[PDB]
Design a protein around this ligand. Structure first.
Ligand code: HEM
Ligand code: HEM
Ligand code: HEM
Ligand code: HEM
Lengths: 146, 142, 146, 142
């Protein structure tokens, strides 16, 4: 899609107040806890036995940061996310066989987590373009799913 | 399928949010129409569809008072919300995929307003309840 | 995506036994009967009041053939399907506001009709490349939803 | 949320299909694995996953027998299917998005074998029944 310059600054500005070392882990940990069937994709992660065990897991934390790193280049490249996300889509499709419904579940959880952090400065209009961006991301993830 | 654990967490949390309910409903509705514009066709007879409008405010409290009541009807929700199922099924005929949209926005507003209380464990139980309220409401469609 | 020459031939071979005038009306009518909320989108069509009403409706008959002609262009143009369907995608999203999950429901009902029509010659294998084609179509249709 | 009428049609339709249930099962599974390959990871301990294979054949009848027994448990499917929900939730850990795929291939196999019988009115009830079996199987996940 066409990105307006005001769309794009809004996004860089929101992502700008975002710290991956803190958001990353919050969102991946919240996902494995609220939609527990996603735990099965991550075999080597450790003690995911309790929420507390999920919440304080360092392999979980590491991956949460890896995940926010990929989103970082989307923000940086809003015009080539499809280009940019082709083998990511291929590993998830063909290597890990991730049901693509889970990309959607992750995007919604990152949003609740950012919401919780920004409070009332996370407005309907910011939400509205954060959403546009989140579904452009989600689409790029399910692009090599055939 | 709400456990005994689930209803207790629901009721407890509900006790915390009760006081702000008209604000949370109002805000969640305004977010749905603004972030998810395909919901707007159902509310075309309304003057202002923008966040904070009058009818937007008034209706958002109507929704939270319905959910507040489902909190007391947690042992049988499909039975408890039968009349509301009909209305949305045949009077308004709402595409039932919009129930997930509203539900996501209520979760987005709870986090905005109760970030400390809206713990991962509170999330599992409110999600489950909200899904169960959506499934009772879509019961009379076919 | 990448289409093999045999894949392409399987598709036009499948589409070749299909009569738009027969399958069109069968599938759209079934869609309005099994998932009744789809009816609210089709305003002018009339008396949809019953399965018998739906089944005997001529405005329904006709839109079923309209939908099949669009699919025929995808079969003809297996390379530019995303390009072929940009305006169709824009209308379903911004003019019509059709919840995008309805595209997969439609795809699934059309497949059941073709199966019942083709019987045992609708093989697992054929079904498999029929299914790759249906997800590309569903992708193309939900492509301008932002 | 199966009505009295949904229950009558399933029990009757079920009676004509009963006899070929092994054939329906085996073919329905083989098609799931063949056209929806993400499902193949769950059956990796099998020697063959090709349509009509020995393990495919045998597991197909197993699935159909379970559906058969669900037929008689229509008044309480979450209660009736509890043990199988655990097996699939915890022992097997099957993402619940695969239940829909299995159901769509079962309807495709029914249309191929009983075309005249698989009417839009038989399809509604069978679809509803299959959605309800799915929901009961996905009940112990969280
Ligand atoms: C927001 C959407 C997502 C993004 C941007 C994303 C991003 C990434 C990235 C950047 C990697 C690096 C792996 C590599 O380079 O080989 C990765 C790996 C992986 N992803 Fe995703 N991911 C997303 C959603 C999901 C979801 C929802 C799941 C499953 C529930 C998932 C499952 C995995 C797994 C299992 C790995 C391999 C890591 C390991 O096992 O060590 N991803 N993902
Ligand atoms: C669990 C979610 C929902 C609940 C609890 C709910 C509840 C209600 C209630 C209590 C009313 C007023 C009915 C009366 O006065 O008897 C109502 C009306 C209405 N609802 Fe919902 N609703 C929900 C979801 C939705 C969704 C998702 C939409 C649109 C996509 C929607 C569209 C409408 C419309 C258009 C009206 C007419 C009300 C008016 O303008 O006076 N509802 N709903
Ligand atoms: C399977 C994918 C689909 C395709 C290829 C398709 C194709 C079309 C086409 C070619 C038109 C004619 C419009 C024009 O040229 O201006 C149309 C209109 C329309 N479509 Fe679709 N469609 C699909 C799915 C759906 C679904 C699932 C729904 C709703 C449940 C839907 C609802 C409508 C409506 C309401 C119209 C307006 C036509 C009228 O009222 O006269 N479409 N579609
Ligand atoms: C309505 C749907 C389903 C029903 C009625 C069903 C029923 C069953 C039954 C009766 C068993 C045998 C368990 C035992 O030995 O006690 C089983 C096992 C199993 N199920 Fe399902 N199942 C369903 C869906 C699925 C789906 C969708 C998947 C994966 C995509 C799946 C994966 C498995 C696996 C991997 C096994 C073990 C196979 C073995 O015996 O080696 N099931 N299921």
């Amino acid at each position: 899609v066409e990105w307006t310059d005001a769309e794009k600054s809004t996004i860089s500005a929101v992502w700008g107040k975002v710290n991956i070392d803190e958001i990353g882990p919050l969102a991946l940990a919240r996902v494995l806890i609220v939609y527990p069937w996603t735990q099965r994709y991550f075999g080597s992660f450790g003690n995911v036995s309790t929420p507390a065990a999920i919440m304080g897991n360092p392999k979980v934390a590491a991956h949460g940061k890896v995940v926010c790193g990929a989103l970082d280049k989307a923000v940086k490249n809003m015009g080539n996310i499809l280009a940019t996300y082709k083998s990511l889509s291929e590993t998830h499709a063909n290597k890990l066989f991730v049901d693509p419904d889970n990309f959607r579940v992750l995007a919604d959880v990152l949003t609740i987590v950012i919401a919780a952090k920004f409070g009332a400065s996370f407005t309907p209009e910011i939400q509205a373009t954060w959403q546009k961006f989140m579904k452009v991301v989600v689409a790029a993830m399910g692009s090599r799913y055939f | 399928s709400l456990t005994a654990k689930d209803k207790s967490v629901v009721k407890a949390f509900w006790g915390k949010i009760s006081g702000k309910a008209d604000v949370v409903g109002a805000e969640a509705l305004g977010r749905m129409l603004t972030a998810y514009p395909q919901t707007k066709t159902y509310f075309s007879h309304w003057a202002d569809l923008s966040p904070g409008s009058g009818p937007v405010k008034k209706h958002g409290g109507i929704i939270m008072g319905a959910i507040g009541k489902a909190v007391g009807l947690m042992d049988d929700l499909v039975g408890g919300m039968s009349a509301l199922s009909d209305l949305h099924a045949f009077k308004l005929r709402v595409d039932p995929g919009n129930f997930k949209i509203l539900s996501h926005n209520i979760l987005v507003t709870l986090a905005i307003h109760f970030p400390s209380d809206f713990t991962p464990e509170v999330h599992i139980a409110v999600d489950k309840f909200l899904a169960a309220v959506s499934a009772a409401l879509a019961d009379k469609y076919r």
